[PDB]
UniProtKB/Swiss-Prot annotation, chain F:
GO biological process: cell population proliferation; negative regulation of stem cell differentiation; negative regulation of transcription elongation by RNA polymerase II; stem cell differentiation
GO molecular function terms attached to this record: RNA binding
Species whose genome carries this gene: Homo sapiens
UniProt note on tissues of expression: Widely expressed. Expressed in heart, brain, lung, placenta, liver, skeletal muscle, kidney and pancreas.
Assigned keywords, A-Z: Acetylation, Nucleus, Phosphoprotein, Repressor, RNA-binding, Transcription, Transcription regulation
Similarity field: Belongs to the NELF-B family.
Subcellular location per the Swiss-Prot or TrEMBL entry: Nucleus
InterPro entries, alphabetized: COBRA1 (IPR010405)
Name of the protein in its database record: Negative elongation factor B
């Protein structure tokens, strides 16, 4: 039984409000509910989302290319923003959101995951001299 | 080097060297990061 | 398993009704709200009512009553060219250009090539059975997507003095792009909440 | 039929002051009455407050067009 | 506006980042003009409503009059306009400030 | 009041006057004319002890319990049996019809009537005869009256139709010259949000009889006034009804499925082959003994935007067929377009006398006129390819600007050839080729039914002249437009004079003042024309004044 690639599932209740289930009561008040959430060690998101009695709204992943192949480029933009915010604000350090938004928009501007590494950025269309100044000067120059 | 040339153009849009729109307004609001500051929305939390 | 197969097919049909409604096609309200018990009552879940031929639906567009679409569920695990031509003869009989084919697990590479071949005269889209078990647009990460009309795109480019090359892009094989059936040259208006402006409306050109 | 902001940007202020200070340093005629002023930059800032600098800023929009703004027309922020 | 904020902030976090610190400016106004909060005030509520409307017009991120640019303008300053109307509502002006 | 034996001010008068005893009389009145309940009979002296008038109490409880009247009739609207509903509504109706004369109790009667689909005839009559009642009554009573009273339904449609024709005249003659905006710019939905069609749909509700009365009104209006606009309104009303999902009218009108294309076909302003096949099937479905709908269909096809759709589809068909080496005869789609256009153009002939036979086409249209259009176009593209090919020596030959006159004969003897040639002229103006333009500009002067001089082509030509805004720099071109073509029908037709005058309004800065004054003097109103041309002349004089200062 089970779904392949998922070798360990930990079950726990959240102690942070961001993971708690915030609902709006009948009086318009925010109530945070303790709900069981399962954190895995593998990734197969389409199968888990299809699975019975799994909330296919808030169920997410920390793997970006899974979100891309499963959900789409805009879901990738949001999830990437959320992961960058998480890793930055883990140590209580605040960065203005517009910088994160600009980075995630730049990466996802071309409708596909454009990695900051030389492959993604030099793959993307820029001037020859700019790609030269990046890295990989000679081969860029030879192709140009 | 990924975000070298991304600039706020004179039509208030954020574009790269290729003149491709990255954001229609900077930070989705067009506001610089210095003058903004933390505040509270008074009507969010209170009951009906 | 005979037990869960009607549940699976019911959720697939629910996703397809939600899709066709989002594509503008006329879907009756109860079809979008059909329960599993209602689904079973509508027709044994296997060998008495699995019939992937019978589940095939025909829907009509609300902007044109003759613009119609077929959803076809083939009964084989891998669909071959002869099934593609069977559905082509079906379309020619009803004169419906656009069609949708579900796929149980996989599709023959030759059948991909035939799908690419008959694209201009007949727009048929394939979809894995696994993908349709959830409507991805309900996911919190997926923002609101709208397909713009041509006059809207021209007004947009005229307002911002833009060329379509300068817009952000979206691949035509994107799950949301496939969900809406958009093709290259279409423009998608994406509406999403923003923590600094409230709402943000961006645009993406299909590629 | 102008769409750019009516406010002089920080970079516009910087370049205008530098250019006008260079002009004043090159014995250009001064467009404001000055008293005990020798540094070109102070005279340029006095002209800027006076809105008497004789410069037009050409702002290029990202479509190959432009708008020409007299410096007196812009709001000195 | 409250319902809109409930949509935008489902977590119920009131902490937000905005250009103009409205409470501090109100306090600055109170101290500049020596506003005694123990006495009735001479500010008409309808003046508050009309003034906040004209101010909302005066704050422009996207300039234009076609539906596209107007919608973009209303979306760009949606959150700040919600905060402005909530903060400078006539009730709080007549009671708190 | 006295209908139900209730004492009124007349009773108070006869009990007050000729009475040496006012005091016991008013006392017994105020006691026996109070509120019927024992708690109040204890509380009324106490209530009144504070100087509190009984007025405030009476008014407040009257308003509250009258709101309860409105709420309870709204609730019983769809509660339980219809028999119980309509029985209680009829009872309260007869009770408060005594009090319908009053200003405070008439809304009770009207709310009851609003919840009644059909009503006793005497109440309907008294609602009609008393103008205060009818002006105070909602349309629920009025639909029922109109179902047996065609006169007032005509009276109500008449001002709406009058303002519709006034707005149509203003839009067809609105002074602004632009390829972008014109009379044919707005979408079908934008033209269907007009108050007239929405009010008429409300006034018809879901009754076929009122629809048939609207139909006969539209027939009379389009025929006796010879104005196609009513036809468009008919189609709008029908498509508006389809938006309301009134199956009582969608499933009875056979031209409703025709309106499926015609709306989808006007919003594109082009008939694709699929919707062409749809229209073919609809025409083939017309059986014998029900061919009157063909007249309706011709009326439905007499819409100006439908004419624009069909003409542009034919013009673009012939434009694209040249690359395929296909003649107009070699295009069954184009034959179907010509069939439908012929059936549409004779629509007023089908209303004037009930003609349910198809009008016939011209052979020389297929073999001479349209092949002459295609003659001019393929020579056009030939000299274009030659210009794009190098090595042209000194003194190159111009494009042949001679005109075959059988072409112009078909323009001036065949309304279909006339209008398709007009839309061809507009299309090449959008292409703005001066050579072919001045080649065919002669012969357009004499054309069939003054269609070259009608509102449609003149408005569209003036809209397309924005693309030719700078082309007025040549006095020869300006004379070709003005002295050649426009001014022939200016002094004899009002619309032509107005269209030339508004052309001068827009193009005054892009011509030398000598020619501007020449065209101004040539466009003097004839001494009997409408206010439009003289107002445009005053604007011309003002503009000529303003040009000398720039």
């Amino acid at each position: 039984q089970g779904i392949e690639q998922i070798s360990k599932v930990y079950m726990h209740l959240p102690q942070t409000d961001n993971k708690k289930k915030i609902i709006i009561t009948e009086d318009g008040e925010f109530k945070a509910l303790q709900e069981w959430i399962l954190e895995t060690d593998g990734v197969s998101l389409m199968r888990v989302l299809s699975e019975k009695d799994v909330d296919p709204v808030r169920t997410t992943s920390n793997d970006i290319v899974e979100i891309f192949t499963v959900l789409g480029i805009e879901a990738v933009r949001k999830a990437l923003e959320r992961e960058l915010y998480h890793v930055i604000s883990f140590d209580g350090s605040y960065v203005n959101y517009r910088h994160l938004a600009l980075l995630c928009d730049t990466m996802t501007c071309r409708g596909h995951l454009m990695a900051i590494t030389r492959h993604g950025v030099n793959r993307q269309d820029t001037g020859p001299l700019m790609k030269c100044s990046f890295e990989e000067t000679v081969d860029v120059l030879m192709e140009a | 080097k990924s975000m070298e040339s991304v600039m706020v153009k004179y039509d208030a849009t954020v574009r790269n060297s290729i003149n491709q729109v990255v954001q229609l307004r900077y930070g989705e609001d067009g506001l610089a990061g210095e003058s903004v500051e933390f505040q509270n929305l008074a009507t969010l939390k209170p009951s009906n | 398993d005979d037990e869960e197969e009607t549940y699976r097919l019911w959720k697939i049909r629910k996703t397809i009704m939600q899709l066709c409604h989002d594509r503008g096609y006329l879907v009756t309200q109860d079809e979008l709200d059909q329960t599993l018990e209602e689904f079973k009552a509508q027709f044994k879940p296997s060998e008495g009512r699995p019939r992937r031929t019978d589940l095939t639906v025909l829907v009509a567009h609300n902007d044109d009553p003759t613009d119609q679409m077929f959803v076809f569920f083939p009964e084989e695990p891998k669909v071959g060219i002869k099934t593609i031509k069977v559905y082509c003869q079906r379309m020619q009989e009803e004169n419906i250009t656009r069609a949708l084919i579900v796929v149980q697990q996989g599709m023959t590479p030759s059948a991909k090539q035939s799908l690419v071949d008959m694209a201009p005269k007949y727009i048929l889209e394939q979809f894995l059975q696994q993908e349709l078990l959830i409507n991805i647009t309900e996911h919190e990460l997926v923002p609101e997507h709208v397909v713009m009309t041509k006059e809207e795109v021209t007004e947009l480019l005229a307002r911002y003095k833009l060329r379509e090359n300068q817009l952000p892009r979206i691949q035509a094989g994107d799950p949301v792009a496939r969900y809406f059936g958009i093709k290259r040259g279409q423009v998608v208006k994406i509406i999403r909440p923003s923590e600094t402006a409230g709402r943000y409306i961006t645009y993406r050109l299909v590629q | 039929k102008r769409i750019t902001t009516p406010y002089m940007t920080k970079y516009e202020r910087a370049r205008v002051l530098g250019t006008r200070a260079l002009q004043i340093a090159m014995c250009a005629p001064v467009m404001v009455e000055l008293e005990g002023e020798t540094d070109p930059l102070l005279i340029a800032m006095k002209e800027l407050k006076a809105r008497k600098i004789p410069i037009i800023i050409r702002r290029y929009l990202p479509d190959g067009s432009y708008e020409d703004w007299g410096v007196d027309e812009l709001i000195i922020s | 506006d409250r319902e809109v904020l409930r949509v935008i902030f489902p977590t119920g976090d009131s902490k937000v980042v905005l250009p103009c610190n409205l409470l501090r400016m109100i306090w600055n106004a109170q101290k500049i003009f020596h506003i005694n909060p123990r006495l009735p005030s001479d500010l008409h509520p309808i003046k508050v409503v009309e003034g906040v409307k004209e101010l909302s017009k005066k704050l422009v991120i996207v300039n234009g009059d076609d539906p596209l640019s107007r919608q973009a303008q209303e979306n760009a300053t949606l959150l700040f306009n919600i905060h402005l109307r909530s903060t400078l509502c006539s009730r709080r002006m007549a009671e708190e400030f | 009041l006295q209908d139900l034996g209730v004492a009124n001010g007349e009773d108070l008068k006869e009990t007050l006057t000729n009475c040496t005893e006012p005091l016991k009389a008013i006392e017994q009145f105020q006691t026996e004319n109070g509120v019927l309940l024992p708690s109040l009979q204890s509380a009324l002296p106490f209530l009144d002890l504070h100087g509190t008038p009984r007025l405030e109490f009476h008014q407040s409880v009257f308003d509250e319990l009258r709101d309860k009247l409105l709420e309870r009739v709204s609730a019983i609207a769809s509660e339980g049996k219809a028999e119980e509903r309509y029985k209680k509504l009829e009872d309260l109706l007869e009770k408060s019809f005594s009090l319908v004369k009053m200003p405070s109790l008439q809304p009770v009667v009207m709310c009851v009537m609003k919840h009644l689909p059909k009503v006793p005839e005497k109440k309907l009559k008294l609602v009609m005869a008393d103008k205060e009642l009818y002006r105070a009554c909602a349309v629920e009573v009025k639909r029922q009256i109109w179902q047996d009273n065609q006169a007032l339904f005509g009276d109500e449609v008449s001002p709406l139709l009058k303002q519709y024709i006034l707005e149509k005249e203003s839009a067809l003659f609105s002074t602004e010259l632009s390829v972008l905006h014109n009379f044919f710019s707005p979408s079908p939905k934008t033209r269907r949000q007009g108050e007239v069609v929405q009010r008429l749909t409300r006034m018809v509700g879901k009754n076929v009889k009122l629809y048939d009365m609207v139909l006969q009104f539209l027939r009379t209006l389009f025929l006796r006034t010879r104005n196609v606009h009513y036809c468009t309104l008919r189609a709008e009303l029908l498509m508006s009804l389809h938006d309301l999902d009134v199956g009582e009218i969608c499933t009875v009108d056979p031209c409703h499925k025709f309106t499926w294309c015609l709306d989808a076909c006007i919003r594109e302003r082009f008939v694709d082959s699929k919707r062409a096949r749809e229209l073919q099937g609809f025409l083939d479905g017309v059986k014998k003994g029900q061919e009157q709908v063909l007249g309706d269909l011709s009326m439905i096809l007499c819409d100006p935007f439908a004419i624009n759709t069909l003409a542009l589809s034919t013009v673009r068909h012939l434009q694209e067929l040249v690359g395929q080496e296909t003649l107009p005869r070699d295009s069954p789609d184009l034959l179907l377009l010509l069939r439908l256009l012929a059936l549409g153009q004779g629509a007023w002939d089908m209303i004037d006398s009930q003609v349910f036979k198809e009008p016939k086409m011209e052979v020389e249209l297929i073999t001479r006129f349209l092949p002459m259009l295609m003659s001019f176009l393929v020579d056009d593209y030939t000299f274009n390819v030659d210009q794009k090919l190098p090595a042209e020596e000194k003194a190159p030959v111009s494009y042949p600007n001679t005109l075959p006159e059988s072409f112009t004969k078909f323009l001036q003897e065949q309304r279909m050839a006339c209008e398709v040639g007009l839309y061809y002229v507009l299309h090449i103006t959008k292409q703005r080729n001066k050579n072919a333009l001045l080649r065919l500009l002669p012969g357009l002067v004499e054309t069939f039914g003054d269609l070259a001089f009608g509102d449609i082509f003149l408005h569209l030509l003036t809209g397309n002249l924005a693309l030719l805004a700078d082309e007025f720099a040549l006095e020869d071109f300006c004379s070709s437009l003005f002295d050649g073509f426009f001014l022939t029908a200016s002094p004899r037709k009002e619309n032509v004079h107005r269209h030339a005058l508004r052309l001068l309004i827009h193009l005054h800065p892009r011509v030398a003042p000598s020619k501007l004054e020449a065209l101004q003097k040539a466009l003097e109103p004839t001494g009997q024309s409408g206010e439009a041309v003289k107002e445009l002349y005053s604007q011309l004089g003002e503009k000529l004044e303003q040009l000398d200062h720039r």
